[PDB]
Ligand binder design. Structure first.
Ligand SMILES: [Zn+2]
Ligand SMILES: [Zn+2]
Length: 59
């Protein structure tokens, strides 16, 4: 698999998934919420099309 990109507790906690702990930068359409990497690749949001929120930004 993959160890991860950010693995430090001193990291800017921004919309961190309370389930996995990964930063939520994606936006699921089917659900209309913000999910993380693991989530997206999870049977929960599997196949679901998500978009990069990039914080306070429309496009
Ligand atoms: Zn998650
Ligand atoms: Zn979804």
């Amino acid at each position: 698999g993959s160890s991860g990109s950010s693995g430090s507790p001193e990291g800017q906690k921004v919309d961190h998934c309370a389930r996995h702990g990964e930063k939520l930068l994606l936006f699921c359409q089917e659900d209309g919420k913000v999910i993380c990497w693991l989530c997206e690749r999870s049977q929960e949001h599997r196949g679901h099309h998500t978009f990069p929120t990039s914080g306070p930004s429309s496009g």
